[PDB]
Amino acid sequence: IESDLERAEERAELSEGKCAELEEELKTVTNNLKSLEAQAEKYSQKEDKYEEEIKVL
Amino acid sequence: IESDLERAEERAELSEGKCAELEEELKTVTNNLKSLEAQAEKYSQKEDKYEEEIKVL
Numbered sequence: 001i002e003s004d005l006e007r008a009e010e011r012a013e014l015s016e017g018k019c020a021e022l023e024e025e026l027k028t029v030t031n032n033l034k035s036l037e038a039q040a041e042k043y044s045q046k047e048d049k050y051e052e053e054i055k056v057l
Numbered sequence: 058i059e060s061d062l063e064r065a066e067e068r069a070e071l072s073e074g075k076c077a078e079l080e081e082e083l084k085t086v087t088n089n090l091k092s093l094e095a096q097a098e099k100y101s102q103k104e105d106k107y108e109e110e111i112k113v114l
Contacts, residue, residue: 001058008065015072022079029086036093043100050107057114 001062005058005062005065008062008069012065012069012072015069015076019072019076019079022076022083026079026083026086029083029090033086033090033093036090036097039097040093040100043097043104046104047100047107050104050111053111054107054114057111
């Protein structure tokens with residue numbers, strides 16, 4: 001029982017480390033996604049203006 | 058020692074569950090990033106095409 005308990009606690013520590021790393025990755029990717037969403041909105045505005053000018057011409 | 062083993066097991070289980078959830082979240086957000094990047098590339102190409110159309114018309 002003692003050996004099994006030691007192994008289980010080591011497993012738990014490893015899982016906690018993995019969870020911390022995953023949190024870091026998630027936050028980084030979230031920031032990148034927000035930046036690209038803003039970029040796409042700028043793209044949309046540019047397209048709107050170009051379409052209007054095309055219609056006028 | 059048996060009670061200690063039970064506590065270690067439950068802590069490991071909780072940590073693994075959180076790890077799985079974080080994995081799913083990172084997968085989803087990374088897929089979103091990939092899709093948005095493809096859209097942005099297509100949008101740059103479309104913008105160049107629209108400017109060419111403006112000039113010719």
